[PDB]
Design a protein that fits this description.
Radius of gyration of chain B: 7 Å
Largest sheet of chain A: 4 strands, antiparallel
Modified residues (N6-succinyllysine) (chain A): 114, 140, 199
Strand content of chain B: 25-35%
Modified residues (N6-acetyllysine) (chain A): 33, 168
Subunit structure (chain A): In pull-down experiments interacts with CedA.
Radius of gyration of chain A: 21 Å
Structural class of chain B: mainly beta
Oligomer: heterodimer
Number of helices of chain B: 0
CATH architecture of the largest domain in chain A: Sandwich
Structural class of chain A: alpha+beta
Family (chain A): Belongs to the heat shock protein 70 family.
Shape of chain A: elongated
Number of strands of chain B: 1
Order of helices and strands of chain B: E
CATH class of the largest domain in chain A: Mainly Beta
Subcellular location (chain A): Cytoplasm; Cell inner membrane
CATH topology of the largest domain in chain A: Substrate Binding Domain Of DNAk, Chain A, domain 1
Chain lengths: 215, 8
């Protein structure tokens, strides 16, 4: 064949730290379907947002948003343990069906995204060259996000511990911990990985008695 | 598995 009907750009969803995770690659022939399992970003997360994206960039913010829906009712669990099955199906009419299903709760939500959605032909060529020009920056972004997500997890866990600790934790331990949480949050907004890891460190150093209490 | 954000 000299002609093939294809989805012209990658389709996928936003995942923790502003990353696009691809479910269908660019140039895949239609009809097609694919599924992948995802989980929650934080302990006890009760809902997830499925932000559907078209584009070749690893930064979610630089891809074309197609729609979004939430899936609620995820039962309490440590982060990474729920199994949220995401399915993208493009039918022969170019209609995109996306669903998410929580295997423990049985709950499911879905959206339909019509065939004319997303980028037009001019924008598709633009998107491809932009991802090529930004290949190496996007590889560094993905590294930055791995570290930001670790930092985000520590911030969350430590804060839950502060709460649960109540008065068992001495007041000057709490003062130092709050300062170190703020400094870690500030660092998370930068693009320097070492800077983030250094604040995680400064936090852990003021956290030993709290680690003892929690334990 | 990659992780998903909660609703804002």
């Amino acid at each position: 064949v000299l002609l093939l009907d294809v989805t012209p750009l990658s389709l996928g969803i936003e995942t923790m730290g502003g990353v696009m995770t691809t479910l269908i690659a660019k140039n895949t022939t239609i009809p097609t379907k694919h599924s992948q399992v995802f989980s929650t970003a934080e302990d006890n997360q009760s809902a997830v947002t499925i932000h559907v994206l078209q584009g070749e960039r690893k930064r979610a913010a630089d891809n074309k948003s197609l729609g979004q829906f939430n899936l609620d009712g995820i039962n309490p669990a440590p982060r990474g343990m729920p199994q949220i099955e995401v399915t993208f199906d493009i039918d022969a009419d170019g209609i995109l069906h996306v669903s998410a299903k929580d295997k423990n709760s049985g709950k499911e939500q879905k959206i339909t995204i019509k065939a004319s959605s997303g980028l037009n032909e001019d924008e598709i060529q633009k998107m491809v060259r932009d991802a090529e020009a930004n290949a190496e920056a996007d590889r560094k972004f993905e590294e930055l996000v791995q570290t930001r997500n670790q930092g985000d997890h520590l911030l969350h866990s430590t804060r839950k511990q502060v709460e649960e600790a109540g008065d068992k934790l001495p007041a000057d331990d709490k003062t130092a911990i709050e300062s170190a949480l703020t400094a870690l949050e500030t660092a998370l907004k930068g693009e320097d990985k070492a800077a983030i890891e250094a604040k995680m460190q400064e936090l852990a150093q003021v956290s030993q008695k709290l680690m003892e209490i929690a334990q | 598995p990659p992780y998903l954000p909660r609703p804002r």
